[PDB]
């Protein structure tokens, strides 16, 4: 996927071009402003040396040659702020354009290209890979052309100056510019290579962070510690051998660097003395190719980043080239005028091409005239709902010809179109505006009385007068303060307002009352005269009072005709309707205490690399005093020869320095690191289930935390300690040597130092990966991305893009112009502060001129001042920007050490309470009223109560929300019931042994997750604390008949089970989680919906294999079909969490009962 | 190790003329670093050295024009043209560009001015020395030319002894003439017993004095 | 102009020690190399030791070397060579030395100071006065010389009416013999000046300081 050059800026203006243009060329002007302070500070040493020899016109020369720096430097002032202002501007504009460009792309788009297309993956898309186009093209190319420049200065210089010599340095100097290349690489690639060091085990974090109540509910936690930590110790062991590769490459390049002084200056000597050169040549022609090589190693990052736009650029630029075959936009539509009421179809399949393989709907012939209501009867399983989208020009449909009133649907205006059929569907979603904004999406243009019209019509307007500011009440996310009823209400409401020509519901009353539920059929019958319609219901009671009634089997329209002809046409309509009849403190270097050993040879290794650039200090500005003094040739050539092996010895000591306090001080973070995960996962788990239902205790949260904080934590103690040391030894020692050498001159530069740090800190945080803030603060639009692309289904409801699209435009061009802003302020300050190296020359050697001409100090103790605190102060600046925070760290290790320090209610680990002998089997509640404490607004259970006996197959049967699993809970012990009493055998379980209750029993949950293992580690996770034993294993795949399958699967016990087990079909997996409770032998079995997919012959033998342990041990069935619940023991109906009758299945049934009308769903 | 040789030892220039001195090294001084180091210091007579030419042909600052150092590989000459009448006294080619820095032998450095007559000059030992048991007759031959001569003793007129201290001046930087004492030191038994003590000077020029004192 | 002066001197026995300076004044001293160079009784140069502007790069020849040891004080000025074990081919006149910035070795050189080593001890002068016989003058001239005999070590001044006489004196050289000196100074004045004004012999010698004035009577 290569985008190459000119593809990657088609989207760019005439003041771009400008800006690229003037941008290069100041790049380039910039560039060639250090080789020139070195052919300038080459004769101003020249004069110094030779000066003072029989101090005149000494000061005259230097006031001189302070102009020449002074105008390099206010000419490098205005060429570096055009160059960052100007590239900045360049990128800021173009990918503004890019970004509401693609945003405008992704709403127009095929349903069907939301099959291959994502959402956590989308979101990927429209944040980091436009950030990441935004990397490269920015200012990586300046940079670029800026290195490129002050290398070719770097040659031509010199080669002005004298050859003989700079070829030397060049000679070597490939290797100067690869390892330059080499450390600015890893500089850039530091924080994704660690992302990729965890990946693993992160992803083994989420899995069971999401699904922890079952994790919990099996004895699963050893499993999934010792889990994680096997890929942990793998991260442990990839990360230090990273990090001694990072530190061997650093430490090379400076070995390189100094011995490469070390060459220069053996040689520069034989010159020198032989007559041809002068100190200034050597210091001219060294410094400037010196300086060239080393810069080339700058230019490589800003290569790679090219690469990574104009392949980024691939996928965005191709969801801005493809155009759907039913372009949502289109205004070259064909639209309609006399558009009377008709619906045609004729011999309709389709498929979802998601799963191209099955045609689910194999024939469809229907023709309905206008005003004609009609209803579609038919079991779970026939696809009603595929043709309502199919209608909607949400799809082609593959066979026939679909048409309305004449003309057909493919060659006309699907907004239009989309728009005049108003539909409501099976589960309508709520979107997070204003209630009166929800409703508006009728039309841009409504009025306040049609809203009240409207909502009076519906009657969905009690709830209405009941909420805070009648027409400011605002919602959350997706809609859930208020109720679900009223939620269907108002989706009824919307797409009422949304006056159509068609009205097309989708089981409207999902989870509504009685009796407004006929308030809102009679408005409905109030506009189906001369508006089609047509519902698609199971609930019977707004279908009876349509005129028609026709009748799916198996996808294909089998039974035709009215009410009175499916009455005597014995189909299936008959049958249904005969059977219906925070405080942060310093207590974190304790977590660190046993490692000791690794920061003491730490902060001894930092000392002298501090220390190591005062000694550079002293040995340039002798080995310069050399040729200053008046000597022999045998003087000069014995002292440079010692003082070059001098530059050897300290460049191999910096080299073994650095690779020990970096292997070191790597090694000790990493080892905390490591211990610090393990251990606040291993006390995450023993938490209980209140703490992990709490919002903002999340999974999204916790896995954060658990995957930042840690490094955070690791941040803090290390680095804080490296770096205050380093820099101490290094300008604590500058300073010292300096007052020592120079009584006036360290004062005057003192006034110079926080200047050149600041220079330093701000240049490193360029190279070294400078990210924008947009990626954190921006948050996504605020969070218009997310819930347009999740909650897309009510878009997928109408055409209302535009209201999004301009929804992007607001809250994304706000900040936009606070990007122009930070750009011209960065640009000055990246331009002022290099200028203050420039004017830090000049200021200190004519000061230093005019001390050196009234014989207070020499050139050989200015040189040293000069270096020692100037370049001292740079290299505290250089180092302290690598150093991470410490306001956020310490916050950080706030949290860690809150956590691993709550304490959870009753320790799943603990024995204390009571330790029963006898058990019986049990169980009984008393005036159990439970609300789950994570809804304080609503109470769920008001007070229910039940008697179980031995073998006694309870059915408990209620509504979906009302009741049917909220035992699993108040039984197994997650939430603490806080009214009533409960009696399982009449013993406490609040005194019993928790993870024993749970030992005891083991049941089948509502859904299995499984994990990524193989099956001899997923059927057997139904027990632990007990070894697998496989004459037990084989028979637990046997008794339910999934043996089968599994011995077909290659590696009949080692076949490998990815995320969630992703492989197989439901048939053979909700199998599994029965097959999991088969070695569980639980005397107590909660099944809940162990037939919601699955064969019915297999029901049988799942039904059996319970039966033939459903004596002796206690049952209970919870579940919506019947196969289960006439053989059951007890039945318990449910509504809302109230028990109203119970008894035998002979007995509620003598009496006509609320069961009587949960038998009538499909029963006959 | 490296040695120096002079070719002319002693020269005979006439004020006004050209005059040439040689430095012959064996061995090839020429150091690592590529350059020779070749000086030609000059002393005149009570003085201390001054320098003259180093590095083969400069001129230390100060030097008149004539002072010409000339150097090929192993032989270095050094030419004055013109001579002067201050430019007298004894020339040394130091080299410097190996392990013992050596300074060469010595070359001296004589103006002729035609010839002179000795001035004679005889004095009596003092009464002083008459009691010291010891006379010494002292004889005084200022501003004479050339260096070369000789003196000798007649005492009584006949003895011509051969106890005689002898002492030469410097040419005079000025003049460019010489002078010489002869010191005839005898015990007094040696002197009393003796009446008259001649002091000739070589057509000979003599004098002497008559009594044990005046 | 650059002044170099030096002292120490004087006699010491074979195998002694001392301690020759040198004080040097005009030139921001800490720069410079410096030498020593000996001049021995034949009026024959020798190179003796050298030491660098820093202090810690001193070369001696192959002979002298391990007994003489020299060094400086950048503070005050100084230059100091340090003798011991010393023969009797020691007997010298030592000077001080500059370095020409362009590779010239010897460029600055001071006076001198003398060393002799000897086993023989100090001496004092003797003096005899020196006048022709009664003065007999030989024209507008009149000879008068002065003899100073039998004294050691070296040094001694001889300075005439106070260093009044300088255009006509002719100071002749000490000869050496049974480790005695025999110098000799002379002056021709007009015969208008010595009847009329004294004359006088104005003498000096270091290790025993006795400075006797004698005046030539005719
Ligand atoms: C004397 O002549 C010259 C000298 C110099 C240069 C050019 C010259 O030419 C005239 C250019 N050098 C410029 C190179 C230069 C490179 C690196 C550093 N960072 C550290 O030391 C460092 C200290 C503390 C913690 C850390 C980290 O946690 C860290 C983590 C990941 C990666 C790292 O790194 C890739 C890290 N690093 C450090 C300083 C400077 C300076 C010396
Ligand atoms: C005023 O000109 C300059 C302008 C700028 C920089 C450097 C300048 O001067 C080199 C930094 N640029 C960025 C490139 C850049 C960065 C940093 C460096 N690390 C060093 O140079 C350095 C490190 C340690 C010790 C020393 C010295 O003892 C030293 C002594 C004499 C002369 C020097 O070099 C003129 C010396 N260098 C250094 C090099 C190159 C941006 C602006
Ligand atoms: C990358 C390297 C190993 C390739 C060889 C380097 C070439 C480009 C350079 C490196 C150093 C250079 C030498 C540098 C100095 C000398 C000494 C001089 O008196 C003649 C030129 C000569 C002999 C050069 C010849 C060319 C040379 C050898
Ligand atoms: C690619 C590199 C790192 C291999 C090693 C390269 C260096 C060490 C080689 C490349 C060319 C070499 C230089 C070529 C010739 C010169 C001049 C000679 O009179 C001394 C050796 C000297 C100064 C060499 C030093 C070593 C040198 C710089
Ligand atoms: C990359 C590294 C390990 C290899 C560097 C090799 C260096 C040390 C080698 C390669 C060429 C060599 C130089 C080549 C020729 C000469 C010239 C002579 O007058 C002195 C020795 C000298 C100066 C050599 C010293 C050693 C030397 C400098
Ligand atoms: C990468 C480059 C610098 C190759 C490394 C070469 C350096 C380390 C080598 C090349 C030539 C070597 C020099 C060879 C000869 C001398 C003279 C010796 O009496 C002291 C050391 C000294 C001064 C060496 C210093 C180290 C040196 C300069
Ligand atoms: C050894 C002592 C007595 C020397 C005195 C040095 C004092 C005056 C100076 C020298 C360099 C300075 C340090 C330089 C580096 C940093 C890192 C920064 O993130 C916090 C400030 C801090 C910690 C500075 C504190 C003040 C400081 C320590
Ligand atoms: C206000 C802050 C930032 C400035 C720091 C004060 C320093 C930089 C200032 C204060 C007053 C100044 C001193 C005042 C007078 C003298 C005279 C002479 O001896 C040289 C300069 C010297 C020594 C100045 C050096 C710079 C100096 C010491
Ligand atoms: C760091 C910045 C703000 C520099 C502040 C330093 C200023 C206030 C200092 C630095 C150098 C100092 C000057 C430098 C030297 C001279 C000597 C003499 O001729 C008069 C005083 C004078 C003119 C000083 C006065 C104060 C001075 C100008
Ligand atoms: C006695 C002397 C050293 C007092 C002068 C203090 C100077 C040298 C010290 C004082 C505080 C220090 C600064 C304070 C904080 C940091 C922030 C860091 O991110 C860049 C360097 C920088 C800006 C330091 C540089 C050195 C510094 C300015
Ligand atoms: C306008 C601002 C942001 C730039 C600040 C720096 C300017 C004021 C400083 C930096 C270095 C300084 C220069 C340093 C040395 C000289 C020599 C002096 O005898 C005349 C002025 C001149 C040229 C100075 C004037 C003021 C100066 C130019
Ligand atoms: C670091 C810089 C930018 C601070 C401002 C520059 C100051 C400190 C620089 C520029 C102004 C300059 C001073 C201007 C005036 C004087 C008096 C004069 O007779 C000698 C130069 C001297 C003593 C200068 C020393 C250098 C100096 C003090």
């Known amino acids: 996927p290569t985008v190459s050059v000119f593809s990657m800026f088609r989207y760019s203006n005439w003041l771009d071009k400008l800006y690229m243009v003037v941008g290069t060329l100041a790049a380039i002007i910039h560039g060639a402003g250090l080789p020139l302070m070195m052919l300038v500070f080459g004769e101003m040493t020249d004069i110094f040396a030779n000066a003072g020899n029989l101090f005149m016109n000494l000061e005259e020369d230097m006031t001189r040659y302070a102009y020449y720096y002074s105008g390099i430097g206010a000419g490098v002032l205005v060429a570096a702020y055009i160059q960052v202002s100007f590239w900045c501007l360049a990128a800021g504009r173009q990918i503004h354009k890019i970004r509401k460009q693609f945003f405008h792309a992704i709403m127009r788009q095929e349903i069907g290209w939301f099959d291959v297309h994502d959402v956590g993956e989308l979101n990927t898309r429209l944040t980091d890979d436009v950030s990441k186009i935004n990397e490269g093209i920015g200012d990586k190319i300046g940079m670029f052309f800026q290195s490129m420049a002050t290398f070719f200065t770097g040659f031509i210089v010199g080669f002005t100056r004298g050859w003989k010599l700079t070829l030397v340095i060049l000679a070597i100097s490939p290797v100067l510019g690869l390892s330059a290349a080499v450390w600015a690489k890893i500089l850039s690639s530091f924080t994704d290579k660690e992302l990729l060091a965890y990946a693993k085990a992160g992803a083994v974090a989420e899995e069971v962070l999401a699904a922890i109540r079952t994790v919990i509910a099996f004895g699963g936690q050893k499993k999934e510690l010792e889990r994680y930590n096997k890929n942990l110790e793998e991260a442990k062991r990839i990360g230090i051998k990273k990090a001694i590769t990072a530190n061997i490459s650093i430490g090379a390049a400076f ?21 041809e050169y002068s100190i200034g040549q050597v210091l001219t022609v060294f410094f400037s190719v010196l300086i060239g090589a080393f810069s080339v190693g700058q230019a490589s990052p800003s290569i790679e980043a090219f690469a990574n736009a104009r392949g980024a650029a691939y996928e965005i630029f191709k969801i801005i080239d493809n155009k759907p075959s039913i372009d949502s936009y289109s205004k070259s539509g064909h639209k309609p005028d006399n558009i009377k009421g008709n619906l045609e179809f004729r011999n309709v399949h389709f498929s979802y091409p998601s799963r191209k393989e099955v045609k689910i709907l194999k024939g469809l012939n229907l023709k309905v005239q206008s005003g004609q209501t009609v ?8 696809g009603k709902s595929t043709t309502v989208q199919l209608m909607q020009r949400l799809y082609d449909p593959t066979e026939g010809m679909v048409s309305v009133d004449g003309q057909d649907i493919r060659t006309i205006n699907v907004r239009f179109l989309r728009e005049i059929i108003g539909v409501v569907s099976q589960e309508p979603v709520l979107f997070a505006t204003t209630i009166a904004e929800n409703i508006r999406y009728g039309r841009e243009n409504v009025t306040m009385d049609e809203i009240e019209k409207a909502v009076k019509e519906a009657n969905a307007y009690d709830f209405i007068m009941k909420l805070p500011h ?89 039974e035709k005709g009215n009410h009175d002809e499916l009455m005597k046409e014995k189909g299936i309509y008959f049958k249904l309707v005969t059977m219906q009849t925070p405080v942060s403190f310093w207590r974190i270097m304790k977590l660190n205490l046993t490692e000791w050993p690794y920061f003491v040879v730490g902060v001894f290794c930092a000392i002298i690399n501090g220390g190591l650039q005062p000694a550079f200090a002293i040995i340039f500005s002798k080995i310069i005093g050399v040729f200053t003094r008046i000597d022999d040739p045998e003087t000069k050539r014995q002292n440079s020869n010692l003082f070059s092996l001098l530059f050897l010895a300290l460049g191999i000591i910096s080299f073994i320095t650095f690779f020990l306090q970096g292997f070191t001080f790597g090694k000790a973070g990493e080892i905390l690191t490591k211990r610090l995960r393990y251990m606040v996962f291993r006390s995450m788990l023993r938490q209980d289930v209140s703490w992990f239902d709490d919002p903002k205790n999340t999974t999204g949260a916790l896995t954060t935390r658990l995957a930042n904080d840690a490094a955070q934590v690791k941040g803090a103690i290390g680095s804080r300690l490296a770096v205050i040391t380093q820099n101490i030894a290094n300008l604590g020692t500058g300073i010292i040597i300096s007052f020592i050498y120079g009584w006036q001159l360290t004062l005057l530069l003192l006034a110079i130092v926080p200047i050149i740090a600041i220079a330093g800190v701000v240049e490193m945080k360029m190279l070294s990966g400078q990210a924008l803030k947009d990626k954190k ?5 605020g969070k218009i991305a997310t819930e347009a692309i999740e909650n897309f289904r009510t878009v997928v409801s109408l055409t209302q893009e535009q209201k999004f699209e301009h929804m992007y435009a607001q809250s994304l061009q706000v900040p936009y112009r606070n990007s122009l802003r930070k750009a011209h302020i960065f640009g000055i300050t990246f331009s002022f502060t290099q200028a203050m190296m420039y004017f830090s ?30 370049f001292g102060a740079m290299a505290v600046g250089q180092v302290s920007s690598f150093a991470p925070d410490y306001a956020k760290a310490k916050i950080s290790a706030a949290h860690i ?141 046997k008794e339910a008949n999934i043996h089968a399958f599994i011995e077909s699967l290659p590696n009949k016990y080692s076949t490998k089970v990815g995320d969630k087990g992703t492989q197989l079909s439901g048939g053979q997996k909700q199998r599994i989680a029965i097959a999991r409770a088969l070695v569980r032998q639980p005397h107590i079995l909660l099944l809940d919906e162990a037939t919601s997919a699955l064969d019915t012959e297999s029901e049988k033998v799942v039904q059996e294999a319970l039966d033939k342990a459903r004596e002796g041990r206690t049952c209970i069935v919870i579940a919506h079909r019947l196969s289960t619940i006439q053989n059951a023991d007890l039945i318990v109906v449910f509504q809302n969490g109230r028990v109203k009758e119970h008894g035998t299945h002979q007995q509620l049934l003598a009496q006509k009962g609320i069961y009587f009308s949960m038998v009538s769903v499909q029963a006959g | 190790d490296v040695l120096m040789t002079q070719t002319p030892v002693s020269l005979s220039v006439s004020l006004g003329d050209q005059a040439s001195i040689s430095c012959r090294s064996s061995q090839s001084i020429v150091h690592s670093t590529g350059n020779t180091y070749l000086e030609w210091y000059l002393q005149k007579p009570g003085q201390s050295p001054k320098l003259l030419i180093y590095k083969i042909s400069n001129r230390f600052s100060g030097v008149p024009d004539r002072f010409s150092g000339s150097g090929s590989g192993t032989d270095f000459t050094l030419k004055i043209s013109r001579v002067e009448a201050e430019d007298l006294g004894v020339y040394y080619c130091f080299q410097a560009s190996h392990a013992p820095r050596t300074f060469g032998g010595g070359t001296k450095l004589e103006i002729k001015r035609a010839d002179a007559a000795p001035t004679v000059s005889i004095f009596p030992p003092s009464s002083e020395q008459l009691t010291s048991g010891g006379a010494s007759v002292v004889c005084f031959l200022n501003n004479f030319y050339p260096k070369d001569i000789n003196v000798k003793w007649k005492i009584d007129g006949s003895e011509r002894q051969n106890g005689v201290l002898n002492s030469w001046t410097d040419q005079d930087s000025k003049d460019s003439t010489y002078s010489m004492s002869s010191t005839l030191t005898l015990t007094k038994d040696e002197y009393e017993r003796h009446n008259s003590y001649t002091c000739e000077a070589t057509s000979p020029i003599v004098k002497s004095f008559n009594r044990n004192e005046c | 102009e650059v002044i170099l002066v030096e002292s120490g001197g004087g006699l010491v026995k074979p195998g002694g020690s001392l301690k020759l300076s040198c004080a040097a004044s005009g030139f921001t001293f800490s720069s410079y190399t410096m030498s020593w160079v000996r001049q021995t009784p034949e009026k024959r140069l020798e190179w003796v030791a050298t030491i660098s502007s820093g202090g810690g790069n ?30 009797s081919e020691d007997t010298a006149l030592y000077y001080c030395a500059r370095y020409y910035r362009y590779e010239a070795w010897f460029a600055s050189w001071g006076q001198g100071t003398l060393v002799t080593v000897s086993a023989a001890k100090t001496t004092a002068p003797s003096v005899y006065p020196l006048a022709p016989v009664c003065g007999d003058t030989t024209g507008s001239s009149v000879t008068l010389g002065c003899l100073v005999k039998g004294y050691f070590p070296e040094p001694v001044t001889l300075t005439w009416n106070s260093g009044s006489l300088s255009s006509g004196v002719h100071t002749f050289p000490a000869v050496l013999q049974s480790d005695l000196y025999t110098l000799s100074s002379s002056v021709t004045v007009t015969s208008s000046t010595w009847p009329s004004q004294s004359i006088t012999c104005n003498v000096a010698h270091p290790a025993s300081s006795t400075k006797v004035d004698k005046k030539i009577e005719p």
């Not at chain 1, 603060?777 to 639009?781: K, Q, S």
């Open chain 1, 255 to 275: 070995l390189l660097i100094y011995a490469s002084y070390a060459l220069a200056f053996w040689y520069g000597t034989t010159l020198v003395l032989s007559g």
């Open chain 1, 375 to 382: 209803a579609l009867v038919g079991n779970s399983g026939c």
């Open chain 1, 470 to 558: 009648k027409f400011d009440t605002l919602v959350g996310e997706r809609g859930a303060q208020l109720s679900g009823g009223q939620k269907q209400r108002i989706a009824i409401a919307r797409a009422l307002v949304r006056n159509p020509k068609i009205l097309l519901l989708d089981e409207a009353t999902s989870a509504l009352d009685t009796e407004s539920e006929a308030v809102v059929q009679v408005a409905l019958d109030k506009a189906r005269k001369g508006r089609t319609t047509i519902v698609i219901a199971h609930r019977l009671s707004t279908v009876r009072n349509a005129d028609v009634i026709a009748g799916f089997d198996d996808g294909v329209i089998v």
């Open chain 1, 777 to 781: 603060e921006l948050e996504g639009a």
């Open chain 1, 841 to 870: 020359y000049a200021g200190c050697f004519r000061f230093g001129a005019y001390l050196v001409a009234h014989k207070l100090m020499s050139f050989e103790d200015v040189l040293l001042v000069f270096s020692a605190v100037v």
């Open chain 1, 897 to 1037: 050490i809150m956590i691993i320090e709550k304490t959870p209610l009753i320790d799943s680990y603990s024995t204390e309470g009571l330790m029963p002998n006898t058990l019986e089997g049990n169980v009984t509640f008393g005036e159990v009223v439970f609300n789950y404490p994570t809804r304080p607004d609503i109470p769920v259970l008001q007070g229910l109560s039940l008697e179980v006996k031995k073998g006694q197959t309870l059915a408990l049967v209620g509504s979906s929300g009302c009741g049917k699993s909220t035992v699993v809970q108040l039984l197994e012990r997650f939430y603490d019931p806080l009214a009533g009493k409960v009696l399982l055998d009449g013993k406490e379980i609040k005194r019993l042994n928790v993870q024993w209750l749970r030992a005891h029993l083991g049941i089948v949950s509502q859904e299995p997750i499984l994990f990524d293992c193989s099956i001899a580690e997923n059927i057997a996770y139904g027990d632990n604390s007990r070894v697998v034993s496989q004459e037990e294993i084989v028979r637990a795949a």
């Open chain 3, 58 to 87: 001193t070369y001696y020849p192959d002979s002298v070397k391990g007994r003489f040891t020299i060094s400086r004080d950048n503070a005050k000025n100084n230059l100091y060579l340090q003798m011991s074990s010393l023969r």
